[PDB]
Amino acid sequence: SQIRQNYSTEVEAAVNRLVNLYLRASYTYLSLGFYFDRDDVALEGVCHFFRELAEEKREGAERLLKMQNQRGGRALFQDLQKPSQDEWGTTLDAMKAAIVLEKSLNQALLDLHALGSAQADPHLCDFLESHFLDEEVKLIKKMGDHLTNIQRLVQAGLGEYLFERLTL
Amino acid sequence: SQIRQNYSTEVEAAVNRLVNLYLRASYTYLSLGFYFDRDDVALEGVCHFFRELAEEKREGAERLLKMQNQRGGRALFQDLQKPSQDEWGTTLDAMKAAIVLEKSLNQALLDLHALGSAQADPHLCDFLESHFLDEEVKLIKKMGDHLTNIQRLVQAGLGEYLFERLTL
Amino acid sequence: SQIRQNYSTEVEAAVNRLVNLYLRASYTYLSLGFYFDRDDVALEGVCHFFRELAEEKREGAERLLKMQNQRGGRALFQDLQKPSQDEWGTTLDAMKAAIVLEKSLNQALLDLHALGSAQADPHLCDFLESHFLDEEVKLIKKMGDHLTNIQRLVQAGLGEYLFERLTL
Amino acid sequence: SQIRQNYSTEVEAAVNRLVNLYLRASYTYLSLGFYFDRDDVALEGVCHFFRELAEEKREGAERLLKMQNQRGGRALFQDLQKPSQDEWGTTLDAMKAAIVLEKSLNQALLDLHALGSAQADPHLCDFLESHFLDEEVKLIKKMGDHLTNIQRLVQAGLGEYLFERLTL
Amino acid sequence: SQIRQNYSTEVEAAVNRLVNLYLRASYTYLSLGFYFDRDDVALEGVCHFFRELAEEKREGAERLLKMQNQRGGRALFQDLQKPSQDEWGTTLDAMKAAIVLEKSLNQALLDLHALGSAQADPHLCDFLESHFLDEEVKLIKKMGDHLTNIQRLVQAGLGEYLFERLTL
């Protein structure tokens, strides 16, 4: 506020909503990760893949919160909604759900970028491009590649085991 | 379930509630940490203290979730309630709030231990004693020590600055 | 006896029975291990898994015997009963048999812990919690995870080969 | 001119004006730095803070001049106006003056970015975003944090000494 | 007794009394040290200062006991009287109490030296001069220096905090 410059209330609010989305995504990946650690599921490579994504999403939320403060905006937190499912089915189901999740985050990033451009806020625009847009694009490509390999593999039980052992 | 042995539905449910409490506590510390990173608050040592506590609470939740799976229980997640405050006042106010938070987690741990003892579940009892009860006791002692030093210091502005520079 | 303190004859006898169980379990794993070393079975990773478990069970028996002496109890040995089977079938059959074995040892540990608590013998209680209860819980979780992966895999012959090569 | 492409005369002129602003800012920080080196002021940490900022501003001017040449524009220099004050008062006064200075440079950067966007000059836009916009935002946040701590501290004499010793 | 030479019963008895004084002093410093470790006192540097003094006094008692045996005297122990206070007030109160304690030990050393001289026992005299008299003089000087700095500092709460952080 002594520091705030060119930082609209609209962008400030949208940044708080994006923090919530990232935290929610981290929570979803925590649930996905532990589901694959169940003794009756037991796919450790899948569990590790999702645990790593949970950490990345949390880090994304923290970078947004740091930026909110750097701009003189005020962080506001909301409840984190529990993940959409309690049980996540097969590795295939889970990877589909993850791609759906990432494309929603990506669309939220693109909406925020468009807001930033409309508000002539190039710092916000650069920030997103630099730390988030390319990371989402790479992550979604990786997930699409996984989904394609899982699909080619599913003798569904054997396929799911080999994917976990040899890719993840 | 092929593995589940001596693990009551009551303990299983209470472990899921304790995971929620730990995650909520981690979220509260995330909010505390960023509040002290505000340009109009600007106490970096306080921000770092709370960020480190956020990570410890998240790690606590993950150890409980791992244990839930080791016992053949089923992790169930609920919404994470937003922190009780949007703005946290002085370092003194914040430390008081943190001690209140930790004593609530501690009481939840003690309740779970008592449940475990009533259900004759010594693995649960040892698990809590080994990874959580002593850590809470040490953390609460550290916070009480901080609160005492903050209180002796508050020329409140000068006191709060020196505590952040020389203790934290 | 010059040293014996708070160590009931009931716990002393039950410790001797638990030593017998551990030695018997070690013997069963020796038989399992060599069965998978047969030229007409030939699953070396499975043989190694069971040989390692035989050593762990023997070490468990020795720690109990050391503790018996530390408390001033008197080690008494009984015949070791030969393993329940001469031939152990598939890796799946063998893993099921191993989980059954470990859950019996675990239940014997829990019974001894309950005896110790009834006799107000906290050293015995801590000893079991510290060296045996968590190890059994981790081992049983690992076996349940293996059983789940074996089951998803069984083209039974191909499944059994890949599990041995890629997991064990 | 054999190299010039998509580089408008408007952007070229505005880049020369921004070079002048950066050099003027470097000159102001040189004056601030030496003022705090006076034997009757004697705050070495404050002097060092401003000397480091003088060097950063000069480096900023040189990067703009390099870019002007890379684009085939022609560097033109104007007089550098002497700093607005001969004596800079307290550390608080000086930090306020520095924040005012940086917010003026920042607004000049944002104006140039908007000009670049209107002229469809994405190289200029990326250049500013990459080397200047985030640096200004971080610097202004740091200064706001300092100002807040100075204010909480001012027993004004004691406060100013401790800030210089313990923060700077 | 086969070894005893020039070692009077008076010096032997006085050495046993001095051992008691040193042990009592060590006990007093143990109580002082833990008092400053209380969560409602919480001055860790003060706690460490007194814990180190407790160890020095115990070491002093052991050197006297070793010397008693080297001379062929017979160590005799008495009850160790509990410290004069249960709660020690401020750092200032505690440092005053410590200086009073050390000056009493010092006077006991000087009395013993005078006894040794009267009994023409130069080994005892050298022993005290070499291991105890200069150490007491240095310790008392250090405590007097601390007391002076504490006094100049006591905004008593702020003074006590800064002394603990910056001196101890």
User: What is the 3 state secondary structure string of chain E?
Assistant: CCCCCCCCHHHHHHHHHHHHHHHHHHHHHHHHHHHHCCCCCCCHHHHHHHHHHHHHHHHHHHHHHHHHHHHCCCCCCCCCCCCCCCCCCCHHHHHHHHHHHHHHHHHHHHHHHHHHHHCCCHHHHHHHHHHHHHHHHHHHHHHHHHHHHHHHHCCHHHHHHHHHHHCC
Is the Cα dihedral D4, D8, D13, D15 positive or negative?
Answer: negative
Q: Which residues contact B18 (CB under 8 A, 6 or more apart)?
A: B64, B108, B109, B112
List of chains touching D (3+ CB pairs within 8 A): A, B
Q: Which residues of C touch B125 (CB under 8 A)?
A: 129
Q: Which of A58, A72, A77 sits opposite B82 (nearest CB)?
A: A77
User: In chain B, which residue ranges form alpha helices assigned H by DSSP?
Assistant: 9-36, 44-71, 91-118, 122-128, 134-153, 156-166
B42 and D144 in contact by Cβ < 8 A? yes
Among D132, D99, D142, D119, residue whose Cα is nearest residue A123: D132
User: Residues 6 or more apart from A60 whose CB is under 8 A from it?
Assistant: A22, A131, A132, A135
CA diameter of chain B:
64
Nearest in space to B123 (alpha carbons), one of B2, B8, B1: B8
| Interatomic CA distance for residues D149 and D152, integer angstroms | 5
Which residues in chain B are closer than 8 Å to C128, comparing Cβ atoms? 122
Which of B2, B123, B125 is the closest to C137 by Cβ?
B123
Judge contact between C119 and C8, C-beta under 8 A. yes
- What technique solved it? X-ray
Is D152 in contact with B162 (Cβ distance < 8 A)? no
Which residues have a Cβ under 8 Å from the Cβ of C13 and sit 6 or more positions away? none
Token pair listed for E24? 């009592």
Radius of gyration of chain A (CA): 18
The one-character DSSP state at D148 is H
Residue C24 and residue C104: Cα distance in Å, rounded? 12
Q: Please state the three-class secondary structure of chain C as a single string.
A: CCCCCCCCHHHHHHHHHHHHHHHHHHHHHHHHHHHHCCCCCCCHHHHHHHHHHHHHHHHHHHHHHHHHHHHCCCCCCCCCCCCCCCCCCCHHHHHHHHHHHHHHHHHHHHHHHHHHHHCCCHHHHHHHHHHHHHHHHHHHHHHHHHHHHHHHHCCHHHHHHHHHHHCC
Phi, psi (degrees; rounded to nearest 5) at B80: -95, 115
Phi, psi of A147 (to 5 degrees): -55, -40
Taking a C-beta distance cutoff of 8 angstroms, is the pair A97, A42 a contact?
A: no
Q: Which candidate from A62, A72, A79 shows the least CB-CB separation from B82?
A: A79
Check CB contact under 8 Å for B5 and C133.
Answer: no
Q: What is the Cα–Cα distance from C109 to C136, expressed in whole angstroms?
A: 9
Pick from B70, B120, B125: which is nearest to C141 by CB?
Answer: B70
Which value in Å is the resolution of this experimental model?
Answer: 1.9
Which chain A positions have a beta carbon within 8 Å of C162's beta carbon? 158, 161-162
Instruction: Say how far apart CA C164 and CA C43 lie, in whole Å.
Output: 7
For tokens 């750097």, name the residue: A70
Q: Which residue of B has its CA nearest to C118?
A: B120
Chains in contact with B, counting 3 or more C-beta pairs less than 8 Å apart as contact: A, C, D, E
Which domain does D166 fall in, by range?
1-168
Alpha-carbon distance C135 to A61, whole Å? 37
C62 appears as a binding residue in the annotation? yes
Structure-block tokens of residue A16: 């708080």
Distance of CA D115 to the CA centre of its chain: 20
Answer yes or no: are the C-beta atoms of D30 and D54 closer than 8 Å.
Answer: yes
Q: Is A55 annotated as a binding residue?
A: yes
Contact across the interface for A69 and D141, Cβ inside 8 Å: yes
Cα A51 to Cα A31: distance, rounded to the nearest angstrom: 9
The CA–CA distances, whole Å, from A10 to A63, A114, E9 equal 19, 12, 93
Residue C21 near residue C53 (C-beta atoms within 8 A): no
CB C80 within 8 A of CB C16: no
CATH number at D144 reads 1.20.1260.10
CB contact under 8 A, B120 and C114: yes
CA distance C109 to A39: 22
The closest alpha carbon to C149, from C95, C87, C89, belongs to C95
Q: Does D87 show up as a binding residue in the annotation?
A: no
d(CA E38, CA D52): 45
Number of domains forming the structure of chain A: 1
List residues bridging with B80 in a β-sheet. Answer: A80
Which amino acid, residue A52? E
Report helix angle C134-153 to C156-166, nearest 10: 140
Cβ separation C133–B126 shorter than 8 A: yes
CB-based burial, B140-155: b 16+ in 10 Å, e otherwise = beebbbbbbbbebbbb
Q: What is the dihedral of CA D63, D64, D65, D67, to 10 degrees?
A: 90
Mutate: best of D111, D133, D146, partner A, most A CBs <10 A: D133
As a whole number of Å, the end-to-end CA separation of chain E is 47
* DSSP tag of B69: H
Q: Which residues lie across from A80 on neighbouring strands?
A: B80
User: Angle between the C156-166 and A156-166 helix axes, to the nearest 10 degrees?
Assistant: 20
Token reading at A164: 């976990």
Does residue B80 sit in helix, strand or coil?
strand
Torsion, CA B141, CA B142, CA B145, CA B147, rounded to 10: -110
Query: Is the Cβ pair C159, A162 closer than 8 Å?
Result: no
> Which among C19, C23, C22, C43 has a CA at the least distance from the CA of C33?
C43
Of B39, B76, B86, the CB nearest to A72: B39
B59 is in an annotated binding site: yes
Q: What count of residues does chain C have?
A: 168
Run of H or E residues at D103: helix D91-118
- Report DSSP state, residue B81: P
Where b means 16+ CB within 10 Å and e means fewer, B86-96 reads: eebebbbebbb
Do the Cβ atoms of D129 and A122 come within 8 Å? yes
Residues in chain A: 168
Collect all residues with Cβ–Cβ distance below 8 Å to D104 and sequence separation of at least 6. D21
Q: Which of E153, E162, E165 to mutate to test the interface with B (most CBs of B within 10 A)?
A: E165
Beta strands in A54-138 (DSSP E): none
CB A138 within 8 A of CB A145: no
Of how many residues is chain E composed? 168
Give CA D68 to chain center in angstroms.
Answer: 19
Q: What distance separates the 2 farthest-apart alpha carbons in chain C?
A: 64
HSE-CB for D112 with a 13 A CA cutoff: 28
Our answer on whether E and C touch (3+ beta-carbon pairs < 8 Å) is: no
- Residue A111 half-sphere exposure toward CB, CA atoms < 13 A: 13
Sign of CA dihedral C38, C41, C45, C48: negative
| DSSP 8-state class, residue B119 | T
Dist. CA C79–CA C82, nearest whole Å: 9
C-alpha span between A6 and A123 (Å, rounded): 9
Q: Give the angle subtended at the CA of C41 by the CAs of C35 and C46, to the nearest 5°.
A: 65
User: How close is the nearest chain C Cα to the Cα of A25, in Å?
Assistant: 27
Number of CB pairs, chain A paired with chain D, less than 8 A apart? 43
Closest alpha carbon within chain B to D148:
B40
Q: How many helices (H) and strands (E) does chain A have?
A: 6, 0
φ, ψ for residue A80, nearest 5 deg: -95, 115
Measured from the Cβ of residue A137, the count of other Cβ atoms closer than 10 Å reads 12
Residue with tokens 């079991």: C128
How buried is A114 (Cβ within 10 angstroms: 0-12 exposed, 13-18 middle, 19+ buried)?
Answer: exposed
